[PDB]
Design a protein around this motif. Sequence first.
Motif, mmCIF file in Angstrom:
data_model
loop_
_atom_site.group_PDB
_atom_site.id
_atom_site.type_symbol
_atom_site.label_atom_id
_atom_site.label_comp_id
_atom_site.label_asym_id
_atom_site.label_seq_id
_atom_site.Cartn_x
_atom_site.Cartn_y
_atom_site.Cartn_z
ATOM 1 N N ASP A 199 -4.031 -12.394 44.603
ATOM 2 C CA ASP A 199 -3.878 -11.023 44.145
ATOM 3 C C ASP A 199 -2.739 -10.880 43.130
ATOM 4 O O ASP A 199 -1.559 -10.917 43.494
ATOM 5 N N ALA A 200 -3.100 -10.686 41.861
ATOM 6 C CA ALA A 200 -2.127 -10.560 40.776
ATOM 7 C C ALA A 200 -1.239 -9.320 40.916
ATOM 8 O O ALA A 200 -0.225 -9.207 40.236
ATOM 9 N N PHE A 201 -1.645 -8.387 41.773
ATOM 10 C CA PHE A 201 -0.863 -7.180 42.015
ATOM 11 C C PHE A 201 0.310 -7.447 42.959
ATOM 12 O O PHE A 201 1.200 -6.605 43.095
ATOM 13 N N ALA A 238 -8.070 -14.504 34.294
ATOM 14 C CA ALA A 238 -8.465 -15.564 33.364
ATOM 15 C C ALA A 238 -9.843 -16.193 33.607
ATOM 16 O O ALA A 238 -10.269 -17.100 32.882
ATOM 17 N N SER A 239 -10.553 -15.722 34.621
ATOM 18 C CA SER A 239 -11.723 -16.458 35.090
ATOM 19 C C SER A 239 -13.076 -15.992 34.535
ATOM 20 O O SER A 239 -14.043 -16.753 34.565
ATOM 21 N N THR A 240 -13.169 -14.739 34.094
ATOM 22 C CA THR A 240 -14.449 -14.230 33.601
ATOM 23 C C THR A 240 -14.183 -13.313 32.414
ATOM 24 O O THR A 240 -13.039 -12.986 32.144
ATOM 25 N N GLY A 241 -15.247 -12.914 31.722
ATOM 26 C CA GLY A 241 -15.162 -11.872 30.711
ATOM 27 C C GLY A 241 -14.153 -12.106 29.611
ATOM 28 O O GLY A 241 -14.028 -13.213 29.094
ATOM 29 N N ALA A 251 -17.400 -2.753 23.680
ATOM 30 C CA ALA A 251 -18.190 -2.827 24.900
ATOM 31 C C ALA A 251 -19.013 -4.118 24.918
ATOM 32 O O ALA A 251 -19.707 -4.443 23.946
ATOM 33 N N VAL A 252 -18.933 -4.836 26.034
ATOM 34 C CA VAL A 252 -19.704 -6.062 26.248
ATOM 35 C C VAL A 252 -20.200 -6.076 27.691
ATOM 36 O O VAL A 252 -19.710 -5.317 28.535
ATOM 37 N N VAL A 253 -21.186 -6.923 27.985
ATOM 38 C CA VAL A 253 -21.677 -7.049 29.350
ATOM 39 C C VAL A 253 -20.712 -7.936 30.132
ATOM 40 O O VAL A 253 -20.523 -9.098 29.786
ATOM 41 N N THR A 254 -20.086 -7.377 31.158
ATOM 42 C CA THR A 254 -19.231 -8.159 32.047
ATOM 43 C C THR A 254 -19.486 -7.652 33.451
ATOM 44 O O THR A 254 -20.200 -6.674 33.642
ATOM 45 N N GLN A 255 -18.903 -8.317 34.442
ATOM 46 C CA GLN A 255 -18.951 -7.826 35.817
ATOM 47 C C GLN A 255 -18.458 -6.382 35.890
ATOM 48 O O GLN A 255 -19.061 -5.512 36.559
ATOM 49 N N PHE A 290 -8.787 -13.950 40.795
ATOM 50 C CA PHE A 290 -9.057 -13.657 42.199
ATOM 51 C C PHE A 290 -10.532 -13.949 42.433
ATOM 52 O O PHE A 290 -11.398 -13.103 42.169
ATOM 53 N N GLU A 291 -10.819 -15.164 42.899
ATOM 54 C CA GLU A 291 -12.192 -15.659 42.974
ATOM 55 C C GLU A 291 -12.463 -16.351 44.312
ATOM 56 O O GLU A 291 -11.534 -16.733 45.018
ATOM 57 N N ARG A 292 -13.739 -16.509 44.650
ATOM 58 C CA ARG A 292 -14.110 -17.121 45.928
ATOM 59 C C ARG A 292 -14.623 -18.531 45.689
ATOM 60 O O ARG A 292 -15.587 -18.728 44.967
HETATM 61 N N1 LIG Z 1 -16.024 -5.129 29.687
HETATM 62 C C1 LIG Z 1 -15.931 -4.392 28.562
HETATM 63 O O1 LIG Z 1 -16.801 -3.832 27.707
HETATM 64 C C2 LIG Z 1 -14.524 -4.113 28.136
HETATM 65 C C3 LIG Z 1 -13.454 -4.408 28.949
HETATM 66 N N2 LIG Z 1 -12.119 -4.151 28.516
HETATM 67 C C4 LIG Z 1 -10.938 -4.452 29.412
HETATM 68 O O2 LIG Z 1 -10.740 -5.842 29.465
HETATM 69 C C5 LIG Z 1 -10.152 -6.114 30.699
HETATM 70 C C6 LIG Z 1 -10.986 -7.089 31.441
HETATM 71 O O3 LIG Z 1 -12.274 -6.594 31.687
HETATM 72 P P1 LIG Z 1 -13.555 -7.516 31.864
HETATM 73 O O4 LIG Z 1 -13.553 -8.728 30.986
HETATM 74 O O5 LIG Z 1 -14.675 -6.589 31.496
HETATM 75 O O6 LIG Z 1 -13.604 -7.758 33.428
HETATM 76 P P2 LIG Z 1 -14.087 -8.965 34.362
HETATM 77 O O7 LIG Z 1 -14.705 -8.383 35.592
HETATM 78 O O8 LIG Z 1 -14.981 -9.911 33.622
HETATM 79 O O9 LIG Z 1 -12.789 -9.782 34.727
HETATM 80 C C7 LIG Z 1 -11.808 -9.288 35.599
HETATM 81 C C8 LIG Z 1 -10.745 -10.339 35.808
HETATM 82 O O10 LIG Z 1 -9.726 -9.798 36.592
HETATM 83 C C9 LIG Z 1 -9.575 -10.651 37.704
HETATM 84 N N3 LIG Z 1 -9.102 -9.908 38.823
HETATM 85 C C10 LIG Z 1 -9.585 -8.746 39.327
HETATM 86 N N4 LIG Z 1 -8.773 -8.362 40.344
HETATM 87 C C11 LIG Z 1 -7.784 -9.280 40.456
HETATM 88 C C12 LIG Z 1 -6.698 -9.385 41.293
HETATM 89 N N5 LIG Z 1 -6.440 -8.385 42.276
HETATM 90 N N6 LIG Z 1 -5.867 -10.437 41.180
HETATM 91 C C13 LIG Z 1 -6.101 -11.383 40.238
HETATM 92 N N7 LIG Z 1 -7.174 -11.289 39.406
HETATM 93 C C14 LIG Z 1 -8.000 -10.239 39.526
HETATM 94 C C15 LIG Z 1 -10.874 -11.301 37.920
HETATM 95 O O11 LIG Z 1 -10.750 -12.496 38.624
HETATM 96 C C16 LIG Z 1 -11.282 -11.522 36.529
HETATM 97 O O12 LIG Z 1 -10.696 -12.686 36.031
HETATM 98 C C17 LIG Z 1 -10.094 -4.838 31.427
HETATM 99 O O13 LIG Z 1 -8.773 -4.228 31.249
HETATM 100 C C18 LIG Z 1 -11.114 -4.011 30.801
HETATM 101 O O14 LIG Z 1 -10.859 -2.675 30.966
HETATM 102 C C19 LIG Z 1 -11.883 -3.579 27.232
HETATM 103 C C20 LIG Z 1 -12.923 -3.274 26.394
HETATM 104 C C21 LIG Z 1 -14.345 -3.260 26.903
#
Ligand SMILES: NC(=O)C1=CN([C@@H]2O[C@H](COP(=O)(O)OP(=O)(O)OC[C@H]3O[C@@H](n4cnc5c(N)ncnc54)[C@H](O)[C@@H]3O)[C@@H](O)[C@H]2O)C=CC1
Length: 404
Positions: A116-118, A54-57, A278-282, A79-81
Amino acid sequence: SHMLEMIIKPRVRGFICVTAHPTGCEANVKKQIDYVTTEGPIANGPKRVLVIGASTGYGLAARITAAFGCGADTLGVFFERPGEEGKPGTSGWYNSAAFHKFAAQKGLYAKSINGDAFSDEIKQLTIDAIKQDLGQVDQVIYSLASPRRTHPKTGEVFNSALKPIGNAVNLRGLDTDKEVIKESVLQPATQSEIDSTVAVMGGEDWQMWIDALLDAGVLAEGAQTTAFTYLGEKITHDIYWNGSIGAAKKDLDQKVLAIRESLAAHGGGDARVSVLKAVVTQASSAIPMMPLYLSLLFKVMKEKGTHEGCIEQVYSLYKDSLCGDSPHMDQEGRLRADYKELDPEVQNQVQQLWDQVTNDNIYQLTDFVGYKSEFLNLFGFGIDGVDYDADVNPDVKIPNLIQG
Ligand SMILES: NC(=O)C1=CN([C@@H]2O[C@H](COP(=O)(O)OP(=O)(O)OC[C@H]3O[C@@H](n4cnc5c(N)ncnc54)[C@H](O)[C@@H]3O)[C@@H](O)[C@H]2O)C=CC1
Ligand code: NA
């Protein structure tokens, strides 16, 4: 004396920025909130929402959309610092601090769980929070992006691989440090690498989540869950959809069967895979080809007036498809929000440009400028109204944050 505060500047190597700006992240979250409130309310949304990631992207965008668009109480897992003196926390920490601030201003519940959400422990902490505060949740958003997963039973650590399958591939890309267009050959994934990737980014954990919430009775009637996926333009297929990460995403299409089966026996619940652009994310910045692909896509879509980031995309996903009367389904029963990226004319233009770009025309052919700006924005840099010259305390605390 003045040691408690610092001036924070970006420190970037490749797709890694090791600093984040608390004020800038707050302003970035506020910008996304203001987008949602300006677009306006979304009717018939869930009122109690769990967002996993829930924290980014995209997950942050889902939390903001649910809260400030649908009016939902939200429980986030991430999962953040945290920050500490002299050491900026991660952007997701600062984003989530801002989210709690703005939610409380609006009189909305916001609680978060960091860990860790896993793991089973975090699932139980989440269960405990729902039981205490909300009773049940109506929607579960599954939005994890991770390079690794420790299996909650065996303790085995799986590591994702981002490789093609079958044949090695000549993949072109943009080295964002050196600003050169260059190619490298990526070897194909081994079966072990593919299995590990499906284990991390496939649908097992999503399934584990829904079953655990179900067993504990904290999933409501008529509830819905969705996990985010990417299919992409054909140009991305070798590295993504038909690569190892694609094998994982393809598993979502299968897990959305057993999970949906579990939920549909529970008051008529459902599960969908939602396909986004597709978007810019971590996460995306770290995938081979993606900085170049995004630079081109941004330019082409801006020319058409269709460019969007996380918040625009997720707002429309909720409004049109998760809560809307005319949802956009495909032949597989996926919800599609990505059609503007996949339009044949857009794909054709992106492809033509892909084959013309060089070191010397990057800025004439692409929106690398926009890519760079959006990348820095993730970490709270380059935001309007933020005084980057001012000292700031990196130790930003969050009320109602449960540390796992
Ligand atoms: N970035 C993109 O262009 C696109 C991404 N997606 C999908 O959207 C989903 C999210 O991706 P993004 O927004 O890009 O990534 P992101 O890097 O911005 O966010 C990842 C999130 O997962 C959390 N996280 C990672 N490991 C964790 C853990 N072990 N325990 C708890 N939280 C954890 C992070 O804290 C963060 O909130 C993914 O399934 C990705 O494949 C789908 C379409 C395109
Ligand atoms: Na996310």
